Symmetry: D2
Amino acid sequence: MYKVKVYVSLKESVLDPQGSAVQHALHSMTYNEVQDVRIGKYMELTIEKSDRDLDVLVKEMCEKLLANTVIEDYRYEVEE
Amino acid sequence: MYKVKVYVSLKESVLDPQGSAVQHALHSMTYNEVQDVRIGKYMELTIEKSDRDLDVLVKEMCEKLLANTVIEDYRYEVEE
Amino acid sequence: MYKVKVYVSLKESVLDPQGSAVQHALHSMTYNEVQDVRIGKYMELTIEKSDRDLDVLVKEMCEKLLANTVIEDYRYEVE
Amino acid sequence: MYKVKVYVSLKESVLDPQGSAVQHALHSMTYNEVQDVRIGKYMELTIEKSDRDLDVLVKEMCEKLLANTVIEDYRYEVEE
């Protein structure tokens, strides 16, 4: 069947307090050449396949659960 | 400037309670064609080339903070 | 619009002289730490909203042009 | 060991003749929803770990062989 990977990232225009806290921790570890950190979501979905189209299925699952379209962009991969 | 995306997931010999809660959530929405859900971390770093080897720098950050080497695996991407 | 990236690669069970030539070339350039080289195909397509299923579209485009289903594997991305 | 993938494509300020040919064939196959086609190179390399920095290594292999510095762009992926 299908192995779909969905990547979710906060649109550039939005701020990321968690990513900044991490960056700070990295500076706290002397890894001070990290001028900025961004934290997103990564998902591996093993999809069978029903009377529903692959693109519609993934877009629906993304557009309403896996992601919050007013703060995060996404892209996805597929391989059988 | 190097853009460094790190992808951490969880060994395949490790359960993913978080992924399960999601599969269940997706099924309740009729997306019953999801056989499994693994949830991972995606991180975009912005590095300013220093006196430290890039591969050395990335390996250390992942191994010491970004990815728990005991229950997770990782890979990364580099771009200028 | 769909920015779509398909990746065609020779199956592991197939030999790749081109890759082995490039690897040799590298060795000549003193990079002997390269124990192997595989050369694949990278296509970046822009697809408009179609009445057809994206996965279905790509599979067909590969099976009959972008990929020789006899010696190559593929995968793809969508944005 | 290191599985290294280098992705060379062609700068966007350059035409992709090889792609237009591909686009045409697809349109002839009736797949007219194809608005454009850019073709690139995919390369999987297995590299022994050395004192050398992967980034430097890759950068160099590209500047002199894998990728034409004048008309192409590259990025890469690393996994142990």
